[PDB]
Amino acid sequence: SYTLPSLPYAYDALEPHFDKQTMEIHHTKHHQTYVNNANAALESLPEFANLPVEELITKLDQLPADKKTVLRNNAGGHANHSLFWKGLKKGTTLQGDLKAAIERDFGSVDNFKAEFEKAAASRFGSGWAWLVLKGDKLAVVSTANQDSPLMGEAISGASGFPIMGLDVWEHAYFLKFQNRRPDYIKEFWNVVNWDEAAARFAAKK
Amino acid sequence: SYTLPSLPYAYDALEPHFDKQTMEIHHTKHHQTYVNNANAALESLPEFANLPVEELITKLDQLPADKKTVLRNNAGGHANHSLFWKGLKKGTTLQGDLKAAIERDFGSVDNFKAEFEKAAASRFGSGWAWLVLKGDKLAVVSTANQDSPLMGEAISGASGFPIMGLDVWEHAYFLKFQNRRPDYIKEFWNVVNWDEAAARFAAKK
Ligand code: MH2
Ligand code: MH2
């Protein structure tokens, strides 16, 4: 079964950029709820219940017809939030092989940032913006609700290994930013954990 | 040119059910943004710009290809919130012809409320739950993001003339209910404007 993961920091570690009350709520309520609803759906699927969530969401089409939606949504939610927390940290510097590949695939870091901001802002309703690795090339993609590019193009409309990503569901920014998702997106650059993105790139490039 | 409609009541007129702080942010920030972004997209379209928003969303297939998405999203937002505000009021009662119609089509009011509650809760991500009139038969449906049944099935996945509706985007309930959407859905019964729903049923158009 799944559990709510412990975090790489206290809820206040991303201040003054991301507010600690949202961090706490986001973890103990929203993420906890995906874990709980996934666990309920997995109760009758002992074979699938053993998989890592990040693997299960690559295998949705193998589930029973009546379980696919609820696990796409909840396992997706669990996988995406588990990744998200790892990708937040202050004080990092984009550098090394990851910086070089971003420059290569988008022309410059600023270009990538503009493209990422645009995908994040233009995702209408709930969803995520991502930096994915598609074989030998990095790309910016977005998905709806709790879909993940790990689910594949057919299900999610995107594909690739997520290097990093931004939650743009309203619960992630309402308290501090209300409807100003662009302001939230700007603050994200101060807490993007480039060290984690770098480690993930190193594992997969 | 669209304009943000003033509300038919003060921001605290739906207390203690729907919280006044949310009403003001919802109206003056979120709905304002749909008005502004729709207007922006319509400036180059004099043949569409001055039509009633509820007319525009019936003719999205008539638009230029590059305009269909932005106006589906923002004209739908404007149309939907305009309905919503008028479709909220304390001190009304489900009764008369509409009450009898609902009993006819759903078996009883409680059956209907259960179905509405179910559709409102099961809309994963952002969206709306609706009571619609599909040629003389009332139905419960929901849509994603700012889609409206008035847009038709191909676009919105639903159809029929909206009688009333509930906004289940997170911003509508985050401050007072956080992630507890079933709790917000229960409170909606205390503020749904059954008089305006009855007038709309009466008109059937
Ligand atoms: O989606 Mn948090
Ligand atoms: O969706 Mn207000």
Locate the domains of chain A by residue range. Answer: 19-89, 90-205
Distance between CA atoms of A21 and A37, rounded to whole angstroms?
A: 23
| Structure tokens given for A179 | 């409807």
Nearest by CB to A169, from B73, B127, B170: name it.
B170
Cα–Cα nearest to B6, from B89, B92, B86, B90? B86
A81 is in an annotated binding site: yes
3-state class (DSSP) for residue B191: coil
Nearest by CB to B170, from A124, A144, A174: name it.
A174
| Structure tokens given for B14 | 């739906």
Is-contact B89 B191, C-beta < 8 A?
yes
* B167 close to ligand 2 (CB < 6 Angstrom): yes
Is-contact A201 A98, C-beta < 8 A?
yes
Looking at A87-169, list the stretches that DSSP marks H as alpha helix, in order from N- to C-terminal side.
Answer: 96-106, 109-122, 153-156
| Helix, strand, coil share (%) of chain B residues, nearest 5 | 55, 10, 35
What are the residues facing A23 on neighbouring strands? Answer: none
Q: Is B122 left (phi over 0), alpha (psi -120 to 50) or beta?
A: alpha
B197 Cβ contact partners less than 8 Å away, ≥ 6 residues apart: B87, B98, B131, B163, B164
Count of H-run helices and E-run strands, chain B? 11, 3
Residues of A with CB under 8 A from a CB of B: 25, 29-30, 33, 69, 73, 124-127, 144-146, 169-171, 174-175, 178-179
Q: How far is the CA of A139 from the centre of ligand 1 (A)?
A: 21
Ligand nearest to the CA of residue A179, numbered in listed order: 2
Distance between CA atoms of B87 and B81, rounded to whole angstroms?
A: 9
Do A19-89 and A90-205 show the same overall fold? no
User: How was this structure obtained?
Assistant: X-ray
Distance between CA atoms of B34 and B36, rounded to whole angstroms?
A: 5
The sign of the dihedral angle between the CA atoms of B30, A75, A22, B186 is positive
Ligand nearest to the CA of residue B85, numbered in listed order: 2
Structure resolution in Å? 1.5
Q: How far is CA A32 from CA A28, A37, A109, A202, B78, in A?
A: 5, 9, 35, 30, 33
Is-contact A41 A74, C-beta < 8 A?
yes
Interior angle at CA A179, CA B142 and CA B30, nearest 5: 60
Backbone angles phi, psi at B160, to 5 degrees: 115, 170
Cα–Cα nearest to B160, from B56, B58, B53, B52? B58
Is-contact B118 B105, C-beta < 8 A?
no
User: Which residue has the least CA distance to atom 1 on ligand 2?
Assistant: B169
Q: Is A146 left (phi over 0), alpha (psi -120 to 50) or beta?
A: alpha
Please, what is the angle between helix A109-122 and helix A181-191, to 10°?
Answer: 140
Instruction: Please give the number of the atom of ligand 1 that sits closest to the Cα of A171.
Output: 2
* A196 close to ligand 1 (CB < 6 Angstrom): no
Q: Identify the CATH homologous superfamily for domain A90-205.
A: Iron/manganese superoxide dismutase, C-terminal domain (3.55.40.20)
The total of other beta-carbon atoms located within 10 Å of residue B82's CB is 19
Type and span of the H or E element at B153: helix B153-156
Cα–Cα nearest to B72, from B41, B36, B33? B41
Interior angle at CA A84, CA A123 and CA B22, nearest 5: 55
Backbone angles phi, psi at B154, to 5 degrees: -60, -40
What are the residues facing B192 on neighbouring strands? Answer: B88
Enter the DSSP assignment of A7.
P
Instruction: Please give the number of the atom of ligand 1 that sits closest to the Cα of A126.
Output: 1
Torsion of CA A99, A100, A106, A108, to 10 degrees: 70
Is-contact B113 B189, C-beta < 8 A?
yes
Distance between CA atoms of B35 and B32, rounded to whole angstroms?
A: 5
Instruction: Please give the number of the atom of ligand 1 that sits closest to the Cα of A169.
Output: 1
Tell me which chain A residue has its CA closest to the CA of residue B144: A125
Is-contact B95 B196, C-beta < 8 A?
no
Q: Identify the CATH homologous superfamily for domain B19-89.
A: Fe,Mn superoxide dismutase (SOD) domain (1.10.287.990)
- Sheet containing strand A127-134, strands side by side: A137-144, A127-134, A161-167
Nearest by CB to B171, from A33, A73, A174: name it.
A174
The distance of A18 to chain B (nearest Cα, Å) reads 17
Is-contact B49 B40, C-beta < 8 A?
no
